[PDB]
């Protein structure tokens with residue numbers, strides 16, 4: 401139900417700006433949704449953005465979302481639907497990924513999300529991710545990967 405979050409917890413300005421791929425989660429969600437692209441524009445503590453997800457019945461849907469960042473945490477709001485709308489805590493910060501944790505409606509007991517800068521991250525990045533997870537009391541063991549976007553390092 402909880403990780404053991406870091407010492408500092410520092411989340412800097414524009415740090416989330418631009419393009420991400422949500423390829424790994426614990427609760428594996430990649431039956432409910434697939435091929436998640438995020439794009440965020442920074443407006444101080446506010447981000448506004450697009451999430452292009454694929455649905456196993458509906459299409460290539462798109463969603464408008466905004467972050468509101470408060471130090472270690474942010475609030476995530478999606479316009480069209482609200483099952484991932486919750487507070488999320490930053491667990492790890494890296495040039496090639498961020499890890500967040502929350503208790504949204506879709507997983508009240510806890511949801512870990514890895515956002516990658518690359519769609520198919522190289523084995524170096526995965527080894528750092530593995531470290532970040534142990535370092536906050538989760539492990540790649542209980543995470544699923546988005547297999548609809550084949551990646552030899554995420555299998």
Ligand SMILES: *[C@@H]1O[C@H](CO)[C@@H](O[C@@H]2O[C@H](CO)[C@@H](O)[C@H](O)[C@H]2NC(C)=O)[C@H](O)[C@H]1NC(C)=O
Pocket residue numbers: 435437452454548549
């Ligand atoms: C995953 O989503 C991406 C981008 O969100 C898809 O790429 C799009 O592919 C269509 C082809 O019909 C183009 O018209 C778009 O302009 C493309 N966008 C980009 C950024 O390339 C991609 O095809 C999707 N893949 C899966 C497996 O769902």
Ligand SMILES: CCCCCC/C=C\CCCCCCCC(=O)O
Pocket residue numbers: 416420422433436438451453467476484488498500513515
């Ligand atoms: C670098 C990460 C940016 C910050 C995003 C905040 C953390 C969690 C976002 C929740 C996304 C949940 C799923 C996305 C789309 C969907 O499943 O419908």
Ligand SMILES: *[C@@H]1O[C@H](CO)[C@@H](O)[C@H](O)[C@H]1NC(C)=O
Pocket residue numbers: 466467468475476477
């Ligand atoms: C995002 O926008 C919503 C709707 O305008 C508003 O409730 C709030 O300021 C923002 N919330 C989050 C979670 O970013």
Ligand SMILES: *[C@@H]1O[C@H](CO)[C@@H](O)[C@H](O)[C@H]1NC(C)=O
Pocket residue numbers: 478479480481
């Ligand atoms: C959805 O977005 C529109 C912006 O056109 C806004 O007026 C509406 O109240 C939003 N609400 C929800 C629940 O998504």
Ligand SMILES: *[C@@H]1O[C@H](CO)[C@@H](O)[C@H](O)[C@H]1NC(C)=O
Pocket residue numbers: 526540541543544545553554555
């Ligand atoms: C996800 O990726 C890692 C390799 O990066 C692997 O050890 C783990 O088993 C994968 N899980 C699934 C369910 O694909």
Ligand SMILES: [Zn+2]
Pocket residue numbers: 401402502503
């Ligand atoms: Zn919690």
Ligand SMILES: [Zn+2]
Pocket residue numbers: 550551552555
């Ligand atoms: Zn493969």
